[PDB]
């Protein structure tokens, strides 16, 4: 019993974190095989950040300008290149702790674990979701750039996020490991803002199924709804539309609890129109949207890595 916001065990990623220094700037790097990946803004001064020409700033650097530290050992940079918004530093030593891995681009609504780092040292691990507006609600201070987000599939680590910046509302923006930003953001000190966010409907439904599995049933009702009527309600409350794909994905949870997806949608509709009336669900007075259907099945079944 119990339901917690749970992250993947971080050990396989901790053995890949290194410190990257270029001039006065220090940030984190990810060391896989003989390459260190880090945000390309490591080569910038604060004035360069106003309007940077990264190819131009980079041509002025040599291999020895990049200091890479792995624990207490200094790594030797033997090459450097840029791919989108990521800098790739070729080093002479392959990481003996390199896990089995993949680089994956995730979609909004998908969750991942973040290993927050400072000076190449891991400080904490937390779970979060790619919001529909492509930002993440992380917890990051100055020095956290280069911290990574990941999932573990079987024994393979899938790297999906690298941290680059904080927006004025305190939310965060970054790239996949191929350097492509999530969202309409750019790595430049210029006016940028997070767009209006929405709630991840399929994830709220998954969390309601987790509450039922844990013995919380006060919100259940005898009613059902159509997908079209539910989507008209969900639009009124700034909830993402629910598709037939989402309904199919919730199938196993629907069969386990005996509550059809559109039956749970009728509970969600009543919660949106009336509130919780002083009650809580899994210790929360708000509807939680940062657990996917897969996260719910994984936690309620004890899958190991």
State how far the Cα of 272 lies from the Cα of 275, in Å rounded to an integer. 6
Active-site residue, selected from the candidate residues 145, 172, 246, 265: 145
Number of residues that bind its own copies (CB under 8 A): 52
Active-site residue, selected from the candidate residues 22, 38, 41, 163: 41
Q: Are 151 and 105 in contact (CB under 8 A)?
A: no
Q: Which does 6 bind (CB under 5 to 8 A by kind): ligand KFU, Cl ion, its own copies, none?
A: its own copies
Phi-psi region for residue 183, left (φ > 0), alpha (ψ -120 to 50) or beta?
left
Closest Cα to residue 106, out of 17, 178, 28, 210?
178
Closest Cα to residue 266, out of 229, 295, 291, 303?
229
Q: Return the ∠ at Cα 127 (arms to 121 and 131), rounded to 5°.
A: 120
Element containing residue 150 per DSSP (H, E)? strand 148-152
SS3 label, residue 103? strand
Q: Is 128 a catalytic residue?
A: no
244 binds its own copies per the rule CB under 8 A? no
Residue 245: count of CB within 10 angstroms of its CB = 9
Q: Indicate the residue among 73 and 141 with the shorter CB distance to ligand KFU.
A: 141
Q: Is 164 a catalytic residue?
A: no
Closest Cα to residue 21, out of 75, 54, 67?
67
State how far the Cα of 120 lies from the Cα of 75, in Å rounded to an integer. 13
Stretch that binds its own copies, among 6-14, 55-63, 199-207, 263-271 (CB under 8 A): 6-14
> Do the bridges between strand 121-129 and strand 111-118 make them parallel or antiparallel, or are there none, so unpaired?
antiparallel
SS3 label, residue 161? strand
Contacts of its own copies in 283-302 (CB under 8 A):
283-286, 299-302
98 binds Cl ion per the rule CB under 5 A? no
Contacts of its own copies in 126-165 (CB under 8 A):
126-128, 137-141, 143-144
Q: Which does 223 bind (CB under 5 to 8 A by kind): its own copies, Cl ion, ligand KFU, none?
A: none
The binder of its own copies chosen from 214, 233, 249, 294 (CB under 8 A): 214
Q: Indicate the residue among 221 and 280 with the shorter CB distance to its own copies.
A: 280
Half-sphere exposure of 225 (CA within 13 A, CB side): 21
107 binds Cl ion per the rule CB under 5 A? yes
Stretch that binds Cl ion, among 64-72, 93-101, 109-117, 244-252 (CB under 5 A): 109-117
Supply the minimum distance, in Å, between the C-beta of residue 104 and Cl ion. 7
Supply the minimum distance, in Å, between the C-beta of residue 76 and ligand KFU. 27
What is the token pair recorded at 284? 């929360």
Contacts of Cl ion in 218-257 (CB under 5 A):
none
Q: Indicate the residue among 106 and 167 with the shorter CB distance to Cl ion.
A: 106
Catalytic residues: 41, 145
- For its own copies, the binding residues (CB under 8 A) are 1-12, 14-15, 115-119, 121-128, 137-141, 143-144, 166, 170-172, 214-215, 280, 283-286, 299-305
């Amino acid at each position: 019993s119990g339901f917690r916001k749970m992250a993947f065990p971080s050990g396989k990623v901790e053995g890949c974190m290194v410190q990257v220094t270029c001039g006065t700037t220090t940030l984190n790097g990810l060391w896989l095989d003989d390459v260190v990946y880090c945000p390309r803004h490591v080569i910038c001064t604060s004035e360069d950040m106003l309007n940077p020409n990264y190819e131009d700033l980079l041509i002025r650097k040599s291999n020895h300008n990049f200091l890479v530290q792995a624990g207490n050992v200094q790594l030797r940079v033997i090459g450097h290149s840029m791919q989108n918004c990521v800098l790739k530093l070729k080093v002479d030593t392959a990481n003996p702790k390199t896990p089995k891995y993949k680089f994956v681009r995730i979609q909004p609504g998908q969750t991942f674990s973040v290993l927050a780092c400072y000076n190449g040292s891991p400080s904490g691990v937390y779970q979060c979701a790619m919001r529909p507006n492509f930002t993440i609600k992380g917890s990051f201070l100055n020095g956290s750039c280069g911290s990574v987000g990941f999932n573990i599939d079987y024994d393979c680590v899938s790297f999906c996020y690298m941290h680059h910046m904080e927006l004025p509302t305190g939310v965060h923006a970054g790239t996949d490991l191929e350097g492509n930003f999530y969202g309409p953001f750019v790595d430049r000190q210029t006016a940028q803002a997070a767009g209006t966010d929405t709630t991840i409907t399929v994830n709220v439904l998954a969390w309601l199924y987790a509450a039922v599995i844990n013995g919380d049933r006060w919100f259940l009702n005898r009613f059902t709804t159509t997908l079209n009527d539910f989507n008209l309600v969900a639009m009124k409350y700034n909830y993402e539309p629910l598709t037939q794909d989402h309904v199919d994905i919730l199938g196993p949870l629907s069969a386990q609890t005996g509550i059809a997806v559109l039956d749970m949608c009728a509970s969600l509709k009543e919660l949106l129109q009336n509130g919780m009336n002083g009650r809580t669900i899994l210790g929360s007075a708000l509807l939680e949207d940062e657990f996917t259907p897969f996260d719910v099945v994984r936690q309620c079944s004890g899958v190991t890595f």
